[PDB]
Structure 1
Amino acid sequence: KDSPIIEANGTLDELTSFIGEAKHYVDEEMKGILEEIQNDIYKIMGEIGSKGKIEGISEERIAWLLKLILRYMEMVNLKSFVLPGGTLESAKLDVCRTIARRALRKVLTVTREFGIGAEAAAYLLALSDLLFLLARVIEIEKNKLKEV
């Protein structure tokens, strides 16, 4: 297959693998959320892998992230920049956040070349924003906010 396709699918496969590790360091609530993300990533990989032939994620899946983002934005009201991984648990999420953005860079290459994955790219962007919030929430509860 095409190299941009292979690289994007591989990075996505890496993303869900790191998420699969991080979900053993979060509560039962976030674990259910991360597992939903894993299913979405699987659906995304099918779209990109089939070069657009197989349907990817729906519009509601992106709207689902935004529901969570708006929800956790009310819990996170920090001003100064913070150092990643205030706690071990949040550190796992900060890692997944960066892998998600790395997946985004690969998908954007596919979109700019093959014209597919625009929906998936938007998902990964919102995903990284959610993983940021989820990481800060954990640090807030345990009060381990390390600032610059």
Structure 2
Amino acid sequence: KIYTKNGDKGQTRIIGQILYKNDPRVAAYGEVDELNSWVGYTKSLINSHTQVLSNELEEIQQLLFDCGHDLATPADDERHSFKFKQEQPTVWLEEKIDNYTQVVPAKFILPGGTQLASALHVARTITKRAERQIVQLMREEQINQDVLIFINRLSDYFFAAARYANYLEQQPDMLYR
């Protein structure tokens, strides 16, 4: 049974230590879970016009699992150790950003356009929400700061990705009048 009932009183285990479910840690690992499921949702909207975006989103979902793992791990835990390193993943998001920025037409942009592009804009803001929550934790506990670097860059990726999605289906970006 996937349901243990150990949580019915509002408490839960992390990597290693029973916390309340409103604990800033659980919230951080939790928002990254919501973001990941949203990314999965965004990916399912992919069609024949926007099919190139499929792999990288699948990749980001794997990266996000690692992020949630480390976030669920206390920094002083003797038995359990940070597994996420920001360098390769973040550099990789930076190339896609530069690539998508040069492709698209160079006022402030409002989030919307194609269904996929709008969903990419949604992921941009859910990324930020998870990030605020990761900073709330960082402020009370030691975290893998690598997670924070990557997440920060990730919302930028999403913006870049959104504009590109609009581009792939001949759709102008929504601009603030």
Asked if these proteins are the same fold (TM beyond 0.5), I'd say yes
1:74 aligns with 2:102: yes
Structure-2 separation of matches of 1:51 and 1:71: 37
Offset, 1:77:
4.2
> Taking every aligned residue pair, what percent have the same amino acid on both sides?
29
Structure-2 separation of matches of 1:4 and 1:76: 38
**1:75-98 CA distance string (max 9 Å, x none):** 1343x1122111111011000110
Greater share of strand: 2
Alignment-mate amino acid for residue 65 of structure 2: Y
Structure-2 separation of matches of 1:108 and 1:56: 19
The range that moved more, 35-44 or 60-69, is 60-69
Corresponding residue for residue 111 of structure 1 = 138
Larger radius of gyration: 2
Alignment-mate amino acid for residue 65 of structure 1: L
Corresponding residue for residue 84 of structure 1 = 111
Structure 2: state its 5+ residue gaps: 1-18
Structure 1 residues 118 and 77 mapped into 2: Cα distance closer, same or farther (>3 Å)?
farther
Corresponding residue for residue 131 of structure 1 = 158
The range that moved more, 122-131 or 21-30, is 21-30
Output the TM-score relative to the length of structure 1.
Answer: 0.91
| 1:6 aligned residue (5, 26, 35) | 26
Please give the secondary structure, in 2, of the residue aligned with 1:74.
helix
Aligned residues: 147
Output the TM-score relative to the length of structure 2.
Answer: 0.77
Structure-2 separation of matches of 1:70 and 1:97: 17
Corresponding residue for residue 143 of structure 1 = 171
Moved over 3 A (4+): none
Structure-2 separation of matches of 1:106 and 1:31: 27
1:23 aligns with 2:51: no
Structure-2 separation of matches of 1:56 and 1:100: 20
